Structure formats: structure tokens, C-alpha cells
Write an enzyme that holds these catalytic residues in place. Structure first.
Site, PDB file in Angstrom:
ATOM      1  N   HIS A  31     -24.688 -58.661 -20.812  1.00 37.73           N
ATOM      2  CA  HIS A  31     -24.901 -57.716 -21.900  1.00 37.73           C
ATOM      3  C   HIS A  31     -25.110 -58.425 -23.234  1.00 37.73           C
ATOM      4  O   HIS A  31     -25.946 -58.046 -24.036  1.00 37.73           O
ATOM      5  CB  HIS A  31     -23.755 -56.698 -21.991  1.00 37.73           C
ATOM      6  CG  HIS A  31     -23.892 -55.793 -23.174  1.00 37.73           C
ATOM      7  ND1 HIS A  31     -24.453 -54.536 -23.083  1.00 37.73           N
ATOM      8  CD2 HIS A  31     -23.655 -56.013 -24.491  1.00 37.73           C
ATOM      9  CE1 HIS A  31     -24.518 -54.005 -24.292  1.00 37.73           C
ATOM     10  NE2 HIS A  31     -24.055 -54.885 -25.165  1.00 37.73           N
ATOM     11  N   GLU A  69     -31.114 -48.584 -27.685  1.00 38.05           N
ATOM     12  CA  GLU A  69     -30.028 -49.261 -26.964  1.00 38.05           C
ATOM     13  C   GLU A  69     -29.562 -48.392 -25.839  1.00 38.05           C
ATOM     14  O   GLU A  69     -29.691 -47.189 -25.928  1.00 38.05           O
ATOM     15  CB  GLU A  69     -28.830 -49.288 -27.878  1.00 38.05           C
ATOM     16  CG  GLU A  69     -27.872 -50.440 -27.764  1.00 38.05           C
ATOM     17  CD  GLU A  69     -27.234 -50.756 -29.141  1.00 38.05           C
ATOM     18  OE1 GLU A  69     -26.409 -49.937 -29.635  1.00 38.05           O
ATOM     19  OE2 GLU A  69     -27.605 -51.817 -29.736  1.00 38.05           O
ATOM     20  N   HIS A  71     -26.220 -46.916 -23.445  1.00 34.75           N
ATOM     21  CA  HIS A  71     -24.793 -46.864 -23.313  1.00 34.75           C
ATOM     22  C   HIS A  71     -24.416 -46.235 -22.000  1.00 34.75           C
ATOM     23  O   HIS A  71     -23.786 -45.194 -21.975  1.00 34.75           O
ATOM     24  CB  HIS A  71     -24.263 -46.042 -24.481  1.00 34.75           C
ATOM     25  CG  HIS A  71     -24.188 -46.876 -25.712  1.00 34.75           C
ATOM     26  ND1 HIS A  71     -23.075 -47.641 -26.007  1.00 34.75           N
ATOM     27  CD2 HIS A  71     -25.147 -47.207 -26.614  1.00 34.75           C
ATOM     28  CE1 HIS A  71     -23.336 -48.359 -27.090  1.00 34.75           C
ATOM     29  NE2 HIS A  71     -24.585 -48.124 -27.472  1.00 34.75           N
TER      30      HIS A  71
HETATM   31  N1  LIG Z   1     -36.169 -55.264 -23.107  1.00 40.83           N
HETATM   32  C1  LIG Z   1     -36.316 -55.953 -24.271  1.00 40.83           C
HETATM   33  N2  LIG Z   1     -37.534 -56.046 -24.807  1.00 40.83           N
HETATM   34  C2  LIG Z   1     -37.709 -56.726 -25.930  1.00 40.83           C
HETATM   35  N3  LIG Z   1     -36.788 -57.343 -26.668  1.00 40.83           N
HETATM   36  C3  LIG Z   1     -35.510 -57.331 -26.264  1.00 40.83           C
HETATM   37  C4  LIG Z   1     -35.216 -56.580 -25.032  1.00 40.83           C
HETATM   38  N4  LIG Z   1     -33.889 -56.754 -24.900  1.00 40.83           N
HETATM   39  C5  LIG Z   1     -33.362 -57.484 -25.906  1.00 40.83           C
HETATM   40  N5  LIG Z   1     -34.354 -57.826 -26.731  1.00 40.83           N
HETATM   41  C6  LIG Z   1     -34.171 -58.595 -27.979  1.00 40.83           C
HETATM   42  O1  LIG Z   1     -33.181 -59.592 -27.686  1.00 40.83           O
HETATM   43  C7  LIG Z   1     -32.406 -59.856 -28.841  1.00 40.83           C
HETATM   44  C8  LIG Z   1     -30.942 -59.767 -28.438  1.00 40.83           C
HETATM   45  O2  LIG Z   1     -30.342 -58.681 -29.151  1.00 40.83           O
HETATM   46  P1  LIG Z   1     -29.243 -57.760 -28.413  1.00 40.83           P
HETATM   47  O3  LIG Z   1     -29.990 -56.720 -27.612  1.00 40.83           O
HETATM   48  O4  LIG Z   1     -28.307 -58.750 -27.753  1.00 40.83           O
HETATM   49  O5  LIG Z   1     -28.348 -56.904 -29.460  1.00 40.83           O
HETATM   50  P2  LIG Z   1     -28.692 -56.472 -30.980  1.00 40.83           P
HETATM   51  O6  LIG Z   1     -29.911 -55.574 -30.981  1.00 40.83           O
HETATM   52  O7  LIG Z   1     -28.793 -57.732 -31.823  1.00 40.83           O
HETATM   53  O8  LIG Z   1     -27.375 -55.658 -31.460  1.00 40.83           O
HETATM   54  P3  LIG Z   1     -26.718 -54.470 -30.596  1.00 40.83           P
HETATM   55  O9  LIG Z   1     -25.560 -55.126 -29.864  1.00 40.83           O
HETATM   56  O10 LIG Z   1     -26.326 -53.350 -31.544  1.00 40.83           O
HETATM   57  O11 LIG Z   1     -27.866 -54.117 -29.690  1.00 40.83           O
HETATM   58  C9  LIG Z   1     -32.724 -58.717 -29.815  1.00 40.83           C
HETATM   59  O12 LIG Z   1     -33.573 -59.139 -30.894  1.00 40.83           O
HETATM   60  C10 LIG Z   1     -33.483 -57.688 -28.997  1.00 40.83           C
HETATM   61  O13 LIG Z   1     -34.316 -56.854 -29.829  1.00 40.83           O
END
Ligand SMILES: Nc1ncnc2c1ncn2[C@@H]1O[C@H](COP(=O)(O)OP(=O)(O)OP(=O)(O)O)[C@@H](O)[C@H]1O
Ligand SMILES: Nc1ncnc2c1ncn2[C@@H]1O[C@H](COP(=O)(O)OP(=O)(O)OP(=O)(O)O)[C@@H](O)[C@H]1O
Ligand SMILES: [Mg+2]
Ligand SMILES: [Mg+2]
EC number: 6.3.5.3
Length: 580
Positions: A31, A69, A71
Site C-alpha cells: 500500500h 484513492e 478505501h
Molecule cells: N495506478 C496508478 N497510476 C498512476 N500513478 C500512480 C498509480 N498509483 C500510484 N501512482 C502514483 O504513485 C505515487 C505514490 O503515491 P501514493 O499513491 O503512495 O500516495 P499519495 O497519493 O502520495 O498520498 P495518499 O496516501 O493520500 O494517496 C503517487 O504520485 C501516485 O499518484
């Protein structure tokens, strides 16, 4: 986690302490870590205005900050809080980019209408004053043991006030403020009323030039927010666990560090500004204090008073071990059969709780938000797990193209995509994740719409059975609100074909553009006409009478509402009326 345990163990050159082992169990989870998806994510075409992921420039003066996101798990254990807390999490994420949160979308995938999930979304959003403007309500027994709850948030930020998400120079400090920290997640009942104050406080600190970088507290708490801020800047941190405002004053240092307490924000700043930050916070009646120091050397040293709690390289926390990927070579597009999802009316569903502030009221596809009299953006969420269940590559790819259609139908020009990858087990089935990720890469290529941000949820499974692969697309467009067509009394036409061929998709698009430009109203729905559309038409006092064509699961047809017959280089057939 054993393969990763021996790696960490190899990297620390000893077995890890207890604190470490908790730090690492959070930061290298799938995660927080993205171990199975970060290589595939590097392959996506991206955008991020002037550096900033998740920010897409609309018009050289404003940008839209937007992200989706999931949940899911939290929502299965506790529908109401799960779902309400995922709203509060996603809102906070968009806040940190400096954007005032303007709209929520919930894409739901349930075996039934789980009321508690609906109201947790509604109540929270109503209480923070951020309206829910659309989303998805996809019902099938296939999600009976794994409800999917994907929330998308959006807001507007001026381009001259975009907040960076990283530290920049030694000497900066990190303030944490918001609600206090208690032993949460080591579901918390988020509060909307605290979150509202967090919003106002953060935006007020933004407006005075005080925020040089920020990151919301989510998974991993103080640990992630602070390691990530410095790790992105290639810096280090000393973090002082004793300065963190506690709700339970007798917590151990590891619990302070890892707590997942709601409504908390990290702000990177100059030490000279931190005391203004602290003053806006308390004015709001928030808690806050200066908690960490940005240092040059890439370590992450965690203190409690003068006792050392942990010290590890910053980059070792930030980069989870990356899994190999599988290359996927798409094959031919199948003859889809119908997988049935139940007719619902999202109109009626949300009406035990709380018409919106969009140019045209929700219920017809894509929602348009007004910035200025002549400036706006559209937003829509879509997925096709019905098709994806039978062909993961193709069904995914088609959700992306049908997203472009929804965006075009409202007059808007696609700008970007945020996507949420909801999947079963990629150790057991590595290829279906690849088909999904490669379908998203190719459809962005084909349509020219880059990915601004996204999220992933893997290991969605019940007794070894996986959910339907479910990628929800949130697409963003640019549209002048003065050119948005309103439903009126008119003739109804099926435009396009009853089946799907990739090489005509672009001709559908070109035709939707021509008609929308002449001011026609258009629906691009996957069964052409829904209950939600029929009921929203009644709100205008209009009754639709039509003979819906028979169409294939994947098709290329839309309905066009017009006083005249469409004139386009695609098939056009008149099928009824709406009126009176
Ligand atoms: N399926 C996906 N497609 C494109 N980019 C992704 C995808 N999943 C994650 N990312 C990118 O990977 C990076 C990791 O961010 P992460 O999803 O760990 O959490 P966050 O957006 O920084 O905060 P939160 O915990 O509130 O989501 C982020 O910039 C996210 O936008
Ligand atoms: N969970 C929800 N919350 C808020 N609005 C919703 C939700 N689900 C659907 N709506 C809104 O109701 C309208 C109807 O959505 P629905 O998905 O049934 O039709 P569609 O998106 O036009 O077609 P399709 O999904 O079949 O291609 C859309 O404007 C949608 O955004
Ligand atoms: Mg964030
Ligand atoms: Mg839909």
C-alpha cells in the site's frame, strides 16, 4: 514479507530493532510501497504542471489538482466510517497541493446498495462543505466479499500558489498540525468539522506565503509524511517525537511515529514562518508544533527527547523492493457477452441525505464545474469490469476510450486521467495486472491523454478468488461553461455503430465534437440510456420516448438530442423524442 525481511536485514547489516520493523512493515507494504506496480507506473505517459504531479494546468492562470484513492478493505470492515474516512483522506491529499477542494466523486462496486457506505460519503462531504458531484454505482454479486470504494477529489489552485510536495534545503523545519495523535491504526471516526478547520487553516497559511512544501498524514503517519518530504528532496531529517501533540499523552515512541490519526497535515517551511503557522493553527482550534528538522545528510534520525529511537538511510525507507514485471502482448478483441450489473438510480439513492453546483445538474454523465463565467472543467469516473472480467486488456482499454467519449459529449477537451487500479493477487496472477497496466498505457497513447496521478489496490480476493479486474478512470476536461448544452424538448438519434472496432473510435470522437459544437445534448452511456438519465430528465419536466437499438456489450453509439437531424460522417438513426 519474508523475501523483503531478508533484504532489509541485508541492508541494515543486522536484524532490525522493533521500531525499524514497524517502520518497515508500513513503508514496504504494498500500500505504501507499490512494489508490484511502480515499474508499470513508470511506463505511463504523465503530466504534472511545472513539476507537480496531480496538477493539471487549465488555462495558464489556474490548475486543477485531482486524485482518486481507494478505501476498500476499511469499507468492508466498517462501511460508514470506512467510506467517510476515505473521503477525509482523499480531500486532504488534494489540499496538500494547495488546491481548495471543490468536488467529490465516489465510484462504488457492491453486491447491493450498502446504505452505510452511501451515507458515510454523503454525511462527511456535507459536513466539510464539499459537494459530491458524480461517481459510479456498479452492482453485481461479484463484489459481494470485496466492496470497492474509490473516492476522487478535485479542487482549484492558482498557478502562482502551487505547493511543492518536498523539502528543498537544509535548515527547513516540518510542522505537523491538525487533530491530535492517539493510537489510531496500530477504523478511526474521522471528523468533518476538524477537517473543515484544517482546510481553512491550511489555505490561510498558503495565502500568506508560509507553506514551502506539504504532505498530508495518511498511512504510516508522521513516518511517511516526513520521510517522503525529505526523500523527495534528497535530504534527511531529524524528527522529534516529543513535539508531536498527543491525544494519549502516555504513548510509546513507535506509536507516535506510526499512528494513523486523522486530520493531520505536514508543512515544510522556514523556521522564521513556523510560528505564524502555529498561530493560524491554534486560531482554528487545531494542534501543532515544529516536529522535524531538514538536514543535509540523507539520514532519517528519530528522537524522543535526547534518546535515539531509530536512524536509517532516508532512501532505504522511501524505496521498497521492486518486483519484476511481465510484458503483455495484446491479442485480438473478443466477442463480449453480457455480464449483468443491476439497474440502479443514483439520483434516488443519494436523496435520503442531500441540486448541485454544476453547470448542468448531476445525472447525465460528466459533471461540469464553473471557475469563471467562461472557464470550467469537467470530471467523470468510469470503469467496465463487465468487459474486463472476460478480457482484462480490452475491457480496461475500452473504459479509457469511453471516458474520452463522456468528456467529449459534454463539450469538454480531455486534459488528463487519474486512475485507480483495483486488482486480485499479482503473485498468483501476474499477467492480468500487466494486461491492466498495459491497457492503461496504450489507451493513453492512443487517445493522447496522459496520466496525472493514480493509486493501486491489490490482493482484493475472497478465498483465493479475485475480484473482476477493476480500473476506475477519472478523466478531466477543459470546457467553457457558456457552451454547455442543457436538456430541452427535441428529437433523439442513435449516432455511431452497435459494435466496436478500434479503428473507428476516432471517427466517433470527431462526430461527437462536431455535434456538441453545434449545441446538441449528448449521452455516452454503456447501455445508452439509464434509469438515472430518465429520472433526471423528469426533473426538467421532460419525458423521453425512444426505441433503443440493440447494441453489443462494447459498442460505439451515443444518443444525440437535437431539434434537427445530425449531419455527420457516421451512421445516424432517429429513435424517438423528448418533450413537454
Ligand atoms: N495506478 C496508478 N497510476 C498512476 N500513478 C500512480 C498509480 N498509483 C500510484 N501512482 C502514483 O504513485 C505515487 C505514490 O503515491 P501514493 O499513491 O503512495 O500516495 P499519495 O497519493 O502520495 O498520498 P495518499 O496516501 O493520500 O494517496 C503517487 O504520485 C501516485 O499518484
Ligand atoms: N455513487 C454515486 N455518487 C454520485 N453520483 C453518481 C454515483 N453513481 C452514479 N452517479 C451519477 O449518476 C449518473 C448515472 O450514472 P451511471 O453510471 O448509471 O450512468 P452513466 O455513467 O451515464 O453510464 P455507464 O456507466 O453505464 O457507461 C452519472 O452522472 C453519475 O456520475
Ligand atoms: Mg499526499
Ligand atoms: Mg457510469
Amino acid at each position: 514479507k519474508l523475501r523483503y525481511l531478508n533484504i532489509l536485514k541485508e541492508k541494515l547489516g543486522r536484524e532490525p530493532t522493533f521500531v525499524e520493523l514497524q517502520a518497515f512493515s508500513v513503508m514496504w507494504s504494498e500500500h505504501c510501497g507499490y512494489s508490484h506496480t511502480k515499474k508499470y507506473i513508470r511506463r505511463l505517459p504523465k503530466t504534472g504542471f511545472e513539476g507537480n504531479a496531480g496538477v493539471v494546468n487549465l488555462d495558464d492562470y489556474y490548475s486543477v489538482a485531482f486524485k482518486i484513492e481507494s478505501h476498500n478493505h476499511p469499507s468492508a470492515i466498517e462501511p460508514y466510517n470506512g467510506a467517510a474516512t476515505g473521503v477525509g483522506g482523499i480531500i486532504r491529499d488534494v489540499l496538500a497541493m494547495g488546491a481548495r477542494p471543490t468536488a467529490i466523486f465516489d465510484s462504488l462496486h457492491m453486491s447491493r446498495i450498502i446504505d452505510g457506505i452511501i451515507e458515510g460519503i454523503a454525511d462527511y462531504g456535507n459536513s466539510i462543505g464539499v459537494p459530491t458531484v458524480g461517481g459510479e454505482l456498479r452492482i453485481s454479486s461479484l463484489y459481494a466479499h470485496n466492496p470497492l470504494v474509490n473516492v476522487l477529489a478535485a479542487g482549484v489552485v492558482r498557478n502562482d500558489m502551487l505547493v511543492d510536495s518536498k523539502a528543498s534545503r537544509p535548515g527547513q523545519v516540518i510542522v505537523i498540525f491538525g487533530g491530535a495523535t492517539g493510537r489510531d491504526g496500530i477504523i478511526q471516526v474521522g471528523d468533518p468539522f476538524a477537517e473543515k478547520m484544517l482546510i481553512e487553516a491550511f489555505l490561510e497559511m498558503v495565502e500568506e506565503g508560509l507553506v514551502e512544501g506539504a504532505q498530508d498524514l495518511g498511512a504510516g503517519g508522521v513516518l511517511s509524511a516526513t520521510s517522503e518530504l525529505v526523500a523527495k528532496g534528497n535530504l534527511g531529517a531529524i524528527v522529534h517525537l516529543d513535539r508531536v501533540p498527543l491525544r494519549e499523552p502516555d504513548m510509546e515512541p513507535w506509536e507516535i511515529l506510526i499512528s494513523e490519526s486523522q486530520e493531520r497535515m505536514a508543512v515544510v517551511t522556514s523556521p522564521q514562518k513556523a510560528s505564524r503557522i502555529l498561530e493560524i493553527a491554534r486560531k482554528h482550534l487545531l494542534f501543532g508544533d515544529v516536529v522535524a528538522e531538514v538536514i543535509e545528510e540523507p539520514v532519517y534520525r528519530v528522537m524522543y527527547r535526547n534518546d535515539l529511537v531509530m536512524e536509517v538511510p532516508v532512501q532505504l525507507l522511501a524505496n521498497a523492493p521492486e518486483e519484476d514485471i511481465v510484458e503483455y502482448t495484446p491479442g485480438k478483441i473478443p466477442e463480449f457477452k453480457r455480464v449483468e450489473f443491476e439497474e440502479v438510480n443514483a439520483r434516488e439513492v443519494f436523496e435520503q441525505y442531500d441540486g448541485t453546483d454544476t453547470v448542468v445538474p448531476p445525472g447525465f454523465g460528466a459533471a461540469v464545474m464553473r471557475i469563471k463565467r467562461d472557464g470550467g472543467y469537467s470530471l467523470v469516473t468510469h470503469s467496465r469490469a463487465d468487459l474486463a472480467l472476460q478480457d482484462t486488456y480490452w475491457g480496461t482499454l475500452i473504459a479509457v476510450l469511453e471516458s474520452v467519449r463522456k468528456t467529449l459529449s459534454v463539450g469538454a477537451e480531455p486534459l488528463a486521467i487519474t486512475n485507480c487500479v483495483n486488482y486480485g493477487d499479482p503473485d498468483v496472477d501476474p499477467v492480468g495486472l500487466s494486461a491492466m497496466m498495459t491497457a492503461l498505457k496504450n489507451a493513453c497513447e492512443f487517445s493522447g491523454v496522459p496520466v496525472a496521478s493514480g493509486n493501486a489496490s491489490l490482493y482484493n480476493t475472497y478465498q483465493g478468488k479475485p475480484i473482476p479486474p477493476t480500473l476506475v478512470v477519472g478523466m478531466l476536461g477543459k470546457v467553457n461553461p457558456q457552451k454547455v448544452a442543457k436538456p430541452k424538448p427535441s428529437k433523439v438519434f442513435a449516432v455511431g455503430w452497435n459494435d466496436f472496432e478500434l479503428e473507428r473510435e476516432k471517427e466517433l470522437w470527431r462526430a461527437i465534437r462536431k455535434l456538441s459544437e453545434e449545441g446538441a445534448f449528448i449521452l455516452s452511456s454503456s447501455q445508452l440510456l439509464t434509469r438515472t438519465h430518465v429520472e433526471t430528465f423528469r426533473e426538467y419536466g421532460l419525458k423521453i420516448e425512444v426505441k433503443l437499438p440493440e447494441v453489443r456489450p462494447a459498442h460505439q453509439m451515443v444518443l444525440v438530442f437535437s431539434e434537427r437531424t445530425p449531419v455527420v460522417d457516421v451512421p445516424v438513426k432517429e429513435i424517438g423524442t423528448l418533450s413537454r
